[PDB]
Each structure stands twice: as C-alpha cells, then as structure tokens.
C-alpha cells in the first residue's frame, strides 16, 4: 500500500 | 462548493498513483 | 532509485538505463508508434491507448 498524506477537512470562514 | 463536508479524510499526495477503492496508507 | 522514490507523494520518478546505441532512442527496449491511420479521432486513440 501506498503512504499517503491525508487532510482532514474542516471548514473555515472564508471572505 | 460542494462534495465535502466537514471532518472528510482527503488524499493530498501521491493522487497520480492511487486508483479509486485501493488500500493506501494514511500518514 | 526506484525502491527508495516508489513512495513518492507528487509525481513520479522513474529510472531507466539508457539505450546501448546513442541515437537510436531515449531508452531501451522497443519502440512503437500506435497510428490511426483512418482518423479516428483523439479520444478513440487514448482508448486504444
């Protein structure tokens, strides 16, 4: 398997 | 806009080698 | 080279010997043109592809 960098989504405002 | 909601686990790496359903390893 | 950037994260890295003649080619091997010699169309080429 191949490692891979994961980015938990958050949400954030945003103008 | 759309097609993702709060707390999803997103692959920011290695998306030229992955195919969809197989097993990768998070980091 | 191979084994240490297989898990390379952004890309990808490959290493290949080069060709024993110079000239007849970027890397060993074979070497084929897939043609379509009737005009299939792009899209229809990369299927065959």
């Known amino acids: 398997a191949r490692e891979v960098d994961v980015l938990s989504v958050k949400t954030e405002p945003f103008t | ?27 | 080279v191979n084994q240490h950037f297989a898990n390379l994260d952004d890309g990808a890295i490959m290493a290949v010997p080069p060709p024993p003649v110079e000239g007849l080619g970027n890397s060993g091997g074979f070497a084929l043109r897939l043609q379509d010699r009737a005009g299939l169309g792009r899209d229809a080429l990369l299927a065959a592809r």
Do not use: H
Not at chain 2, 4 to 25: F, H, M, N
């Open chain 2, 1 to 27: 806009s759309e097609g993702l909601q709060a707390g999803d686990k997103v692959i920011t790496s290695s998306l030229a080698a992955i195919r969809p359903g197989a097993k990768v390893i998070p980091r």
